[PDB]
Design an enzyme around this catalytic site. Structure first.
Site, PDB file in Angstrom:
ATOM      1  N   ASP A  15      33.192   7.649  -8.951  1.00 34.72           N
ATOM      2  CA  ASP A  15      34.164   6.539  -9.056  1.00 34.72           C
ATOM      3  C   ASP A  15      35.308   6.771 -10.063  1.00 34.72           C
ATOM      4  O   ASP A  15      36.023   5.816 -10.383  1.00 34.72           O
ATOM      5  CB  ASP A  15      33.452   5.183  -9.288  1.00 34.72           C
ATOM      6  CG  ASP A  15      32.577   5.179 -10.487  1.00 34.72           C
ATOM      7  OD1 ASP A  15      32.818   5.978 -11.431  1.00 34.72           O
ATOM      8  OD2 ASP A  15      31.652   4.315 -10.504  1.00 34.72           O
ATOM      9  N   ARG A  29      39.693   4.935 -12.846  1.00 35.03           N
ATOM     10  CA  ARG A  29      38.432   4.332 -12.449  1.00 35.03           C
ATOM     11  C   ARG A  29      38.677   3.399 -11.284  1.00 35.03           C
ATOM     12  O   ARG A  29      39.536   2.529 -11.331  1.00 35.03           O
ATOM     13  CB  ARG A  29      37.897   3.601 -13.647  1.00 35.03           C
ATOM     14  CG  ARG A  29      36.624   2.814 -13.457  1.00 35.03           C
ATOM     15  CD  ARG A  29      35.437   3.656 -13.008  1.00 35.03           C
ATOM     16  NE  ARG A  29      34.140   2.956 -13.113  1.00 35.03           N
ATOM     17  CZ  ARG A  29      33.627   2.195 -12.147  1.00 35.03           C
ATOM     18  NH1 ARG A  29      34.300   1.964 -11.022  1.00 35.03           N
ATOM     19  NH2 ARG A  29      32.416   1.643 -12.346  1.00 35.03           N
ATOM     20  N   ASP A  34      30.771   0.581  -8.156  1.00 36.71           N
ATOM     21  CA  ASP A  34      29.936   1.336  -9.114  1.00 36.71           C
ATOM     22  C   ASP A  34      29.180   2.358  -8.322  1.00 36.71           C
ATOM     23  O   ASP A  34      28.356   2.016  -7.492  1.00 36.71           O
ATOM     24  CB  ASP A  34      28.997   0.427  -9.856  1.00 36.71           C
ATOM     25  CG  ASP A  34      28.364   1.134 -11.092  1.00 36.71           C
ATOM     26  OD1 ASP A  34      29.067   1.918 -11.706  1.00 36.71           O
ATOM     27  OD2 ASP A  34      27.296   0.687 -11.478  1.00 36.71           O
ATOM     28  N   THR A  35      29.476   3.614  -8.601  1.00 36.94           N
ATOM     29  CA  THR A  35      28.609   4.718  -8.113  1.00 36.94           C
ATOM     30  C   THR A  35      27.478   5.050  -9.078  1.00 36.94           C
ATOM     31  O   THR A  35      27.643   4.902 -10.270  1.00 36.94           O
ATOM     32  CB  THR A  35      29.439   5.995  -7.824  1.00 36.94           C
ATOM     33  OG1 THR A  35      30.219   6.395  -8.955  1.00 36.94           O
ATOM     34  CG2 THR A  35      30.418   5.822  -6.628  1.00 36.94           C
ATOM     35  N   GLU A  37      25.492   7.365 -11.626  1.00 37.58           N
ATOM     36  CA  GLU A  37      25.898   8.481 -12.477  1.00 37.58           C
ATOM     37  C   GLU A  37      25.314   9.791 -11.893  1.00 37.58           C
ATOM     38  O   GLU A  37      24.332   9.762 -11.135  1.00 37.58           O
ATOM     39  CB  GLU A  37      25.473   8.229 -13.938  1.00 37.58           C
ATOM     40  CG  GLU A  37      26.117   6.969 -14.564  1.00 37.58           C
ATOM     41  CD  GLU A  37      27.646   7.057 -14.762  1.00 37.58           C
ATOM     42  OE1 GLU A  37      28.111   8.155 -15.108  1.00 37.58           O
ATOM     43  OE2 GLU A  37      28.399   6.036 -14.605  1.00 37.58           O
ATOM     44  N   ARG A  75      41.463   4.199 -18.993  1.00 37.63           N
ATOM     45  CA  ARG A  75      41.436   4.561 -17.596  1.00 37.63           C
ATOM     46  C   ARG A  75      42.236   3.637 -16.779  1.00 37.63           C
ATOM     47  O   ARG A  75      42.136   2.449 -16.900  1.00 37.63           O
ATOM     48  CB  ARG A  75      39.966   4.547 -17.077  1.00 37.63           C
ATOM     49  CG  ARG A  75      39.082   5.516 -17.799  1.00 37.63           C
ATOM     50  CD  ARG A  75      37.645   5.578 -17.271  1.00 37.63           C
ATOM     51  NE  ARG A  75      37.030   4.271 -17.349  1.00 37.63           N
ATOM     52  CZ  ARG A  75      35.810   4.016 -16.920  1.00 37.63           C
ATOM     53  NH1 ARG A  75      35.023   4.981 -16.438  1.00 37.63           N
ATOM     54  NH2 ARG A  75      35.374   2.768 -16.872  1.00 37.63           N
TER      55      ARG A  75
HETATM   56  C1  LIG Z   1      35.596  -0.959 -12.922  1.00 35.00           C
HETATM   57  C2  LIG Z   1      35.873  -1.508 -14.307  1.00 35.00           C
HETATM   58  C3  LIG Z   1      35.151  -1.067 -15.424  1.00 35.00           C
HETATM   59  N1  LIG Z   1      35.439  -1.568 -16.649  1.00 35.00           N
HETATM   60  C4  LIG Z   1      34.625  -1.219 -17.842  1.00 35.00           C
HETATM   61  C5  LIG Z   1      33.406  -2.146 -17.893  1.00 35.00           C
HETATM   62  C6  LIG Z   1      32.304  -1.222 -18.348  1.00 35.00           C
HETATM   63  O1  LIG Z   1      32.234  -1.327 -19.804  1.00 35.00           O
HETATM   64  P1  LIG Z   1      31.011  -0.607 -20.605  1.00 35.00           P
HETATM   65  O2  LIG Z   1      31.441   0.850 -20.748  1.00 35.00           O
HETATM   66  O3  LIG Z   1      31.063  -1.277 -21.939  1.00 35.00           O
HETATM   67  O4  LIG Z   1      29.757  -0.736 -19.786  1.00 35.00           O
HETATM   68  C7  LIG Z   1      32.716   0.148 -17.902  1.00 35.00           C
HETATM   69  C8  LIG Z   1      31.942   0.604 -16.678  1.00 35.00           C
HETATM   70  O5  LIG Z   1      32.516   1.850 -16.208  1.00 35.00           O
HETATM   71  P2  LIG Z   1      31.640   3.036 -15.673  1.00 35.00           P
HETATM   72  O6  LIG Z   1      30.815   2.529 -14.482  1.00 35.00           O
HETATM   73  O7  LIG Z   1      32.712   4.065 -15.344  1.00 35.00           O
HETATM   74  O8  LIG Z   1      30.712   3.457 -16.821  1.00 35.00           O
HETATM   75  O9  LIG Z   1      34.108   0.069 -17.658  1.00 35.00           O
HETATM   76  C9  LIG Z   1      36.454  -2.517 -16.810  1.00 35.00           C
HETATM   77  O10 LIG Z   1      36.670  -3.008 -17.958  1.00 35.00           O
HETATM   78  N2  LIG Z   1      37.202  -2.931 -15.775  1.00 35.00           N
HETATM   79  C10 LIG Z   1      36.935  -2.484 -14.521  1.00 35.00           C
HETATM   80  O11 LIG Z   1      37.596  -2.944 -13.572  1.00 35.00           O
HETATM   81 CA   LIG Z   2      29.666   4.472 -12.488  1.00 30.88          CA
END
Ligand SMILES: Cc1cn([C@H]2C[C@H](OP(=O)(O)O)[C@@H](COP(=O)(O)O)O2)c(=O)[nH]c1=O
Ligand SMILES: [Ca+2]
Length: 129
Positions: A15, A29, A34-35, A37, A75
């Site tokens: 993702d 991102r 959510d994919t 890991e 991102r």
């Molecule tokens: C998809 C997305 C993720 N995020 C943040 C929330 C999550 O915070 P935390 O890192 O504190 O869990 C993280 C999840 O991304 P990943 O699934 O890439 O880890 O990215 C956003 O803030 N906005 C978004 O639209």
């Molecule tokens: Ca992910």
């Protein structure tokens, strides 16, 4: 919403991808998904799917939603299109991502993706097997 150009710099995982946007290298991102890991079940398959879809594309485009364009890690947050086909939607439709992270104001394609997820789940595909 509007599609804007970008070029692939490098696949990362299911993702996230590194793209050049307005001439600058950014990690993107994908919105609303959510994919797993890479280390988790279907993670490698999700990474591979995304990598192929980006690498085989003649044209990559990014589409920002109405809200936040960057997350707290810097991102870019977008819907990504490979030759007109939305990568985010394609992952969910294959059972390789769940709809997730649906924040108010950046959720234009929520229903489209939820429909995809229902179809994957009915087909028992991948994560729904
Ligand atoms: C998809 C997305 C993720 N995020 C943040 C929330 C999550 O915070 P935390 O890192 O504190 O869990 C993280 C999840 O991304 P990943 O699934 O890439 O880890 O990215 C956003 O803030 N906005 C978004 O639209
Ligand atoms: Ca992910």
């Amino acid at each position: 919403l509007h599609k804007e150009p970008a070029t692939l710099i490098k696949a990362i995982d299911g993702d996230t991808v590194k793209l050049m946007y307005k001439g600058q290298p950014m990690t993107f991102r994908e919105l609303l998904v959510d994919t797993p890991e890479f280390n988790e079940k279907y993670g490698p398959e999700a990474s591979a799917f995304t990598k192929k879809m980006h690498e085989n594309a003649k044209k990559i485009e990014v589409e920002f939603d109405k809200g936040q364009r960057t997350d707290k890690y810097g991102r870019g947050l977008a819907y990504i299109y490979a030759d007109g086909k939305m990568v985010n939607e394609a992952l969910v439709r294959q059972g390789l991502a769940k709809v997730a992270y649906v924040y108010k104001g950046n959720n234009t394609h929520e229903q489209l993706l939820r429909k995809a997820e229902a179809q994957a789940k009915k087909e028992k595909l991948n994560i729904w097997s």
